[PDB]
Each structure stands twice: as structure tokens, then as C-alpha cells.
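BUG-707 | component: ligand-complex export | severity: low

The export step for PHY jobs runs without errors, but we want the raw record kept on the ticket for reference. Input record follows.
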Amino acid sequence: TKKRVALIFGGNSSEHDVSKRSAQNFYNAIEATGKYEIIVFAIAQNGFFLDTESSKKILALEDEQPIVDAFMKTVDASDPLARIHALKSAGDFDIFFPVVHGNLGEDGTLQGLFKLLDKPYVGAPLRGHAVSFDKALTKELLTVNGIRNTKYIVVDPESANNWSWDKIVAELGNIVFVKAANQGSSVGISRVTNAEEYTEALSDSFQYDYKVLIEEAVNGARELEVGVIGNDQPLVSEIGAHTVHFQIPAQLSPEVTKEVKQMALDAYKVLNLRGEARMDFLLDENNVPYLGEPNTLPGFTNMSLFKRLWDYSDINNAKLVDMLIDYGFEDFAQNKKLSYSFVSLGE
Amino acid sequence: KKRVALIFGGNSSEHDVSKRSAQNFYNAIEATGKYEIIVFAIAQNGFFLDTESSKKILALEDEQPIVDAFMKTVDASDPLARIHALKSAGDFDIFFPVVHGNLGEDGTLQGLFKLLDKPYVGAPLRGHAVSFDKALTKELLTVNGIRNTKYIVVDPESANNWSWDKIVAELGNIVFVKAANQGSSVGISRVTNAEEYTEALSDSFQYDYKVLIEEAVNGARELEVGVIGNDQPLVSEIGAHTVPNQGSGDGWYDYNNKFVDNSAVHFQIPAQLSPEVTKEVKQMALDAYKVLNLRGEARMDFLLDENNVPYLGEPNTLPGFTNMSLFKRLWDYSDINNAKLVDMLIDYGFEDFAQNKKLS
Ligand SMILES: Nc1ncnc2c1ncn2[C@@H]1O[C@H](COP(=O)(O)OP(=O)(O)O)[C@@H](O)[C@H]1O
Ligand SMILES: C[C@@H](C[P@@](=O)(OP(=O)(O)O)[C@@H](C)N)C(=O)O
Ligand SMILES: [Mg+2]
Ligand SMILES: [Mg+2]
């Protein structure tokens, strides 16, 4: 109605399609408040930003490739800023609302661009996304801070050489997970139980990153996911447990519930997160909760957990997205007080 | 033939230092004779300036007049106005960031480099991000067994729980208070009493909402070591420097001793150390590089206690390159002068960009 929101979706990842679905439910939520004007932008799998008109169609779920191909013919290959030129195609706006799942929205890249343009945005700062995205970086901060998670080892092409399977077993056990540090959703992940699987797991993971993480596996089969939103004073959702069949509120003992919610809160702060996040846990056979991977940009599709978690806290989609936008505006205001002055130099 | 986008300046507390480092890097690249250079300045308002207004700023001409002039040609309706100047000279092949502080060492510029999909010299986004936050750095070092000072991290609310008596009992009567995300010794204070403590908390909290309070190492001198490369990084010789009344007094390497007046500090290359310590610092530097996720270039600084025990002070992802900067001299002792230095740094940048394409 006045304030303009730039809703960005898409991304050069394997989760390109899931992004479109999340973007739609966010759009409807922002629209349902009647306070802002939405301007949508899409990022094709080739990294290029698309104009508002082309992206409006892609959001509607129309065949994407023809739309992209047509756009690529209007691009000037001699412009070093061509990949982001389409961002001005619809004029000035007030705040970015990122919903790009994968290697652009969760690793901190887009957030760098947002700061350079001195414009507000929703979600965590670039540092927060960067630490939450890097598998190794996440475990190191959580461990030094006392938040329970599995035992692990970080290797590279050369160090991996000092780690025979027998040594890995002495440290982590006979059942481990090998994986590329920076990579998302799938590839580079392996379930190792013996020396044969380990040798080939390293070769595989070393194709997606030069830094591999090896961690022991939790025996228990009970996934827990909790949402957290806010800045200086975070809110924690109810717990969703596995009984894609999520049970809410999770049926755990009063003690396990408060412990899992506290870990989610403590983790959010040590990981330097802001705005929104989903904390995924693993509960073993003795009801001991282990914080797994943090999610800086959760899915908002019809079937994803974050789409209905806040309903159990009386926060509907409209209120939720409105809170996310207020937090974004607030943090920009706080960072505006910070000084970057200095005593002028000379000869 | 290849074009190099030398960027400097930025809205940062180390804005003027960047100027000095920039001219030097320019001359070094020019000396190789294999690259063309396009200079880009970023004013204090965060606006990139055209290649012409910038060449003048590099030549040391007054900034403001040249900036104001430029600001009258800006389209204030364009959301991409701050970075529009980047196209004001055509296409280039690689980025060479020389902006110290707030934009180059925190990951911001590296975010843009990834979007335009061009190679670049220096560490990746996560490296700078993790290396600039003083608290995140010391956290990654501690969990890896890399020696660093005892400290506590607080925010404006958390700060009121630590009264002076509580601090003295936890870290001793001489402590250093600093803003987590800063450089060149700005936002940092040497604290010895209750009034200086509280005055310093206020001073630090005007540069960041996160400050560190760490115990002071009574050592008479500091150490610096350069490290470059990607998957198989090299380590330079250790360099040293000491300010008047450092150990046997209150003197320290503040903003005034580094850039205002440096004609009173003593430097040693290589540093006078035992074979043991020399080996220990070179390995700590190497280890910290990997942990911190750095690439291309860096400089590791150390604190030395009375008994000569080394403490990893802090990493610097885009180290200074001025006429009193150690990163401009150290590599000469490894048969790598300023020329071969930047040629290697540029090759590293291209090699990592190429390697990155395959890893997908
Ligand atoms: N814990 C400490 N013990 C002794 N001296 C310190 C300590 N911390 C900082 N200093 C002094 O203050 C200066 C600040 O350095 P540093 O912490 O690396 O910050 P900056 O980013 O400003 O270089 C150092 O060069 C050193 O002389
Ligand atoms: C004295 C030193 C400064 P600097 O490189 O390092 P510090 O952050 O420790 O000041 C700084 C520019 N970031 C030099 O130029 O080499
Ligand atoms: Mg520094
Ligand atoms: Mg220093």
C-alpha cells in the first residue's frame, strides 16, 4: 500500500523449484496484511537476475526455460553488472525479502549485495548464514559453546591422509557420516560403516569442497524441528516430532521439551542468526537431544513444517511475515548508530 | 592484456590507510608488465566512483571536492546507484580488493564478486566474515587448541554484570577492551582502573554491539607473519616490532603509533627468537589459516609473554601494504619481491575461481 518489498526467489541450486513454491506462500502472506507493495524478482539457474515481468510468470509456475531464454537475448555481455541489472528494471524499493533456497541465499552472498546497496532486508546477516551454511564451522562454534551435537573430525586433501578407517573408529565409532563442508541438500553425503566405503566416500565428498567433515552417527530415529524468530529477544516455536508426518506439539517429557527449546535459542545466538531460523535435532534412544543443522531460510511450501509451526503459537502467515519485516527494519535501524569514523591521515 | 579491478577506500575507519596500500599494490602490478589496471574508489558514503575521479583520489588529491562533483551526477531513484560506477570503464577480468575494514574484510565485497561471477584475489566470503569478528575468531582458535588470550565477550546488557572487581578477579588489573568487528586499533583501549574501564566500554560500544574484554600479555614485543596460497600455503619469515614502554610500561601499538607517527618503533626481520618458538609460531599461523578458511593472502599477528610464550593475537585477511607495513617487506626474504607477490596472488585468485567451477 506504500512500503515496497522486493521478494527474491529462484537460485542456481538443486532446490530451484521448491523456491517458487515458498515465494508464493510468502507473497500471499505479505499481500494479506495490506501494508506493503510486492515487487518480485527471480534468479535463473544460470545466476542472472530476471525483470519483474518475467519473474511474475515464473512465480505463477509457467514453463520457466522459454521465459529465461527470451530474457537472455536482451542481456549485454559487455556489462560487468549484467547479472544484477534487472534489479533496477522496476525502480526503487524499500526492503529485500530473500527466499532463494541454496547456494545464494543461505551462504551469505546475497546479503553482501544488500549491505552494499544500503537497504534493509529480512533474515540473518551474511555472517550467520556463512557460519550456518558451512558444516564444519557450525559444529566448531556449537562445541566450544557447550551445545550438544555429535563428535566430529575435519579433514582436507592432505590431512585426510593421516586418517585411516581404524583411527576414525577410535575417535567417532564404526558408523560415521562423511560430507563436504560447503554444499547443500544432497551430494557429498555418505553413510560409512567400513574402510571400503570410507575410502570412496572421501573421493566423492572431495568433489564438492576441499574441506570434508566426518561425524559419528546418532543411533536413535526421532527427528525434532523447532522454529525461532526475532533479534535481541527471540521467540521459539513449539516442537515438531516425527511419528513427512509431523506431530505438534512434540510429545516429549516436560524436561526434554525445555532443553530442546533452550538449545535452539542458545544456538541461534552463537551462530549469529537474526530474523528467522529452524533448528533440527536428533533424539537418541535415551531421549538425549543433539542439535543437528541450522536452517537460515526454511521452506514455506504447502507441505513444509515452517508453514504451520507458528499456528500453534497463534501466529498466522500474515502476522508471521509482518513480524519478519518489522525485525528486518529494526536491525537496519540499529546498525545505523554504528560509527565508521577515523582520524584523517597525511604525509 | 588481462584487466585488474583495483578497488580501494570504502566507508571505513581505515579508509586513509587503504590509499597508501593501494598506490603500492598499483605499482607492484604495473611492474609485472602483464596486466592492465582500472582503479575504483569507494567514498565514505559507500558510493563507488568512476575510474577518472578515482585515479585522482589515488594521486592523493583532495577527496570531498572530487566526491561532491560526482554526487551531482547520481540518479537517486536507481537502487543500484552505489555500484553503478563499476561499469563506467567496460569489462574487466579479476578483482583486487584493497579496501581495509568495513567492506573488504567483512565479506561484503566478496558477496558482490560472487554475484557478478568474476575471479578475485584474497580469501572467500566466509573467511573474512569469520576473521573480522574478533569473538568468532577466538572461538575457532580455542576449539582447535591454538593459544590465544583469556577473554570474555559481552553486549550492552551483558556488560552491566561485570563490575571492575569481577573483571580484575577474572583477568587481572590490566585488560584490553575492544569492539568485535574493527581494525587499525580503533575502538580499542588499554584499561588499568575502574574509570578507564567504564569509559572504554562506552567507546567500544559505538563501533559494534559486541565487545571483547581480554587479559593483557605483558610481553615487550609483537610478532607478524605473512601467509599466502590456497591448498598448499607458504609461510614467510617472522617479523617483529616494539613501541617505547611496551613491556616495562603502558605503551602499545595504537592508531597513533601505526599511522600517525611510526618513526619511534623498532622492527626486526627475522625476529630474534629461539628455534623452538620460531617453529611454534609458523605452525600456529599455518593451522589458523586453514581453520579460518582463508585463501590467497593473510598476515597473522602474535603476542609474546614475559617467558616468550606465543599467543595468536589476530588474523588480517587484507593486510596493509604501506611503506611501514610488514606484509610489504617480509616476502622479500623468500625471494618474492612485491612484483612476484602480486603475480602469485593473482594466479591464486584465478586458480581458485577455476577450481570452484569444477566443484559443482
Ligand atoms: N590481549 C592483549 N594483550 C596485550 N596487548 C594487546 C592485547 N590486545 C591488543 N593488544 C595491543 O593493542 C593492539 C590491538 O591489536 P588487535 O587486537 O589485533 O586489534 P586491531 O584490529 O585494531 O589490530 C595490538 O597491536 C597490541 O599492541
Ligand atoms: C600496522 C599494520 C596495520 P593493519 O594491517 O593491521 P592491524 O589490523 O593489526 O592493524 C591494518 C591495515 N589492518 C600494517 O599496515 O601492516
Ligand atoms: Mg586487525
Ligand atoms: Mg593487530
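Assignee comment: Attached the raw record above. Chain B touches chain A through 67 residues (CB under 8 Å).
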